Structure formats: structure tokens, C-alpha cells
């Protein structure tokens, strides 16, 4: 009496920054958001759902993980249980494919990887839609790693309707490349700024205006326009946080030297822009054309342990055990 599924998926870093929720217990976002798939950084998850568990069990990387750090699995185990009228506890095990002691963030593809596991087992059937309104309910992030390439996730107004898609763009992804410059909370630094900031009006009133351009950027390969769009974006969502009460910054002293260095590249001719989430880590979007001569540039201040290019990467892969 056991039932079980287990799936791959790659992370996916937003151009267009997902920021704020409408809706706390669905995952329901203030604005929808556009990301790239990568290739070079995965989760592998199985899930065993089974009568004879005497209680939910994570292990991540070959370790047991604590209450706090099962906190979020056991919270999306509950939601997929309850909409299968299934009263099993279960074991998931997973194991993160990213550079060992870089802090990438995984629940995107953690989260994605147990929704499309937890759909094999349970025998949910979805649709990839369906799928990626699930793997909302888990992370916001995760539902567009269940789409390769470029995904935008709709922030739509319900469950029914909050929900990412791959954007067609002929191919042009296979032509970019992402370089991680690794530099020594996510989810309450939002809330505190949506609910306290002076700035997060202005984030709202410009979201629309960038997807728009990303969209045309995208129509035409135009990369120093899609650039220019994802660096004032991200700079706009870390902005909002110095207008939050009590106000903070996500940003490191190594941040700033690599937004700096990034801009120093683009004036020596290195057509490449920077973006950065909810922590000190410098994500570089650059042409593949272009990579080598970026990490030319930047080996004068990073070693080549720092500097981890990663390109297009696929949707969700899921496995029958
Ligand atoms: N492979 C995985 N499978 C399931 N859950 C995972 C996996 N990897 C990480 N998680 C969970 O997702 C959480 C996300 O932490 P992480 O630092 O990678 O991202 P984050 O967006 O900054 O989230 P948070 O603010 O909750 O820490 C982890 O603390 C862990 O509880």
C-alpha cells in the first residue's frame, strides 16, 4: 500500500521580478513575472506515499531535515493530500544539483520537482498548466520551472487563473547564457515592503511597461533592449526594500563590486546586464557569443570557483518508479 512518482526540474531566475502577493494562502502575485529555465541547476525528487508511514519525512542531499526545514514540504504535502482525499504520510527525497556551499536558491526547482513527483504518485494527471497552478501553491517561482526556456507567469486573479506558459521565441534562448557571480528572508522582505513601502506603488506602476518590452525585445532578438528592461527591473525591486519601515537591502559589499564590474564590461563593449534576487548573488545575462570574453573580464576579481555560466534549460520531466 505505498504510491510514488519522481521528477527533474531546472531553475529558472526572473527577468521580470516577481514581487508581492495578493494572496497569501494561494500564492496569488501582485504582478505577473517573466524567467528563463537554466540548465545548469536542477532538483531530483522522489516521493513515496505509503499506509505504513507514521509521519512526513524529508531528506535533502542524503540528510534528515528538521521541522523547520520540512516546514515547507510538510505545508504542500498537506495541500496535494487534501485535494486527493489522501491520508498517507509520505518520504520525499531529494537531492539539488547546484554548486556545493553557493547559496542557490532551490525552492523553484525543489518545489517544482515534489509538485510533478507528487503528480506521478498520486496519479493527479495534470496538465502542464494544471501542474504549474499546483507548483504555485508550493513557491510562486516554482510553477514557471515547470516550462523551459522563456515562461511568464499570469498572475491572473484566482487559482484558476495565476499560472506561467513558455513564451515562444524562436529559439533566440539557445543563443543566451547566464554567469552566476557567487558573493560570500525572501518571503518576509516582501511582505514587510508590500505592506510597508513608500516605493511599492512605483514597482506596480512599471511592471506592465516592462513585460510589454521583454515581449518586443524578445519579437525582435534585440538583446541590449531586453538587457536594459531585466537590470532597471531588478534595481526598481531592490529599491522598493530602502522604502520599507524598518528599511534593508538585500545587497552585500561583493554585490555592489560585481553590479559595478558589469558595468565597466558594457562599457568596454560587452553588451551584458546584471540581475539579482533576494540575496547577495550577482546573476549576469550575456550572449553566448559573448561569454568567454565576460569571463575574461571579470577573472581579475573573481576566482574561476565564483563565476558558474548556465544556459536554457528545459520544463518539468516527470518518471513513473
Ligand atoms: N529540493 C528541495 N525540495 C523541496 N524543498 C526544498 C528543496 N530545496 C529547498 N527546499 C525548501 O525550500 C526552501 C527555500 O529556501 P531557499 O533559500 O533555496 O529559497 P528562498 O526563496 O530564499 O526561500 P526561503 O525564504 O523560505 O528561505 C528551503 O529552505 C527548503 O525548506
Redesign the pocket.
Known amino acids: 500500500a505505498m504510491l510514488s512518482g519522481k521528477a527533474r526540474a531546472h531553475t529558472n531566475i526572473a527577468l521580470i521580478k516577481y514581487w508581492g502577493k495578493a494572496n497569501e494562502e494561494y500564492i496569488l502575485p501582485m504582478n505577473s513575472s517573466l524567467s528563463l529555465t537554466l540548465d545548469a541547476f536542477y ?1 531530483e ?1 522522489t516521493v513515496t506515499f505509503d499506509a505504513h508511514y507514521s509521519e512526513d519525512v ?1 531528506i ?1 542531499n542524503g540528510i534528515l ?1 528538521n521541522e523547520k ?5 510538510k505545508e504542500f504535502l498537506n495541500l496535494v493530500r487534501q485535494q486527493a482525499d489522501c491520508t498517507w504520510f509520505a518520504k ?1 527525497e ?3 544539483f547546484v554548486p556545493t556551499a553557493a ?9 517544482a ?2 509538485a510533478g513527483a507528487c503528480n506521478v504518485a498520486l496519479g493527479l494527471n495534470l496538465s502542464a498548466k494544471d501542474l504549474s497552478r499546483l507548483a504555485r501553491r508550493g ?1 510562486g ?1 516554482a510553477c514557471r520551472s515547470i516550462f523551459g526556456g522563456f515562461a511568464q507567469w499570469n498572475k491572473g486573479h484566482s487559482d484558476e487563473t495565476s499560472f506561467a506558459e513558455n513564451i515562444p521565441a524562436n529559439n533566440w534562448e539557445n543563443e543566451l547564457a547566464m554567469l552566476f557571480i557567487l558573493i560570500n ?4 522582505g516582501m511582505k514587510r515592503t508590500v505592506e510597508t513601502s513608500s516605493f511599492y506603488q512605483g514597482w506596480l506602476d512599471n511592471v506592465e511597461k516592462d513585460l510589454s518590452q521583454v515581449h518586443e525585445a524578445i519579437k525582435t532578438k534585440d538583446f541590449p533592449r531586453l538587457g536594459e528592461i531585466i537590470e532597471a527591473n531588478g534595481l526598481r525591486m531592490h529599491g522598493t526594500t530602502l522604502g520599507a519601515v524598518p528599511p534593508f537591502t538585500y545587497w552585500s559589499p561583493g554585490s555592489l563590486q560585481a553590479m559595478a564590474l558589469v558595468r565597466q564590461a558594457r562599457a568596454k563593449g560587452i553588451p551584458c546586464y546584471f540581475t539579482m534576487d ?2 547577495p548573488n550577482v546573476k549576469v545575462l550575456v550572449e553566448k557569443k559573448n561569454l568567454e570574453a565576460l569571463k575574461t573580464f571579470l577573472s581579475e576579481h573573481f576566482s574561476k570557483e565564483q563565476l558558474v555560466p548556465a544556459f536554457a534549460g528545459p520544463g518539468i520531466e516527470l518518471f513513473e518508479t
Open positions: 532538483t525528487t524529508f535533502l531535515q526545514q520540512t516546514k515547507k514540504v520525499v531529494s537531492q539539488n547559496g542557490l536558491a532551490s525552492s523553484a526547482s525543489g518545489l520537482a515534489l513557491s517561482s528572508s525572501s518571503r518576509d533576494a540575496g
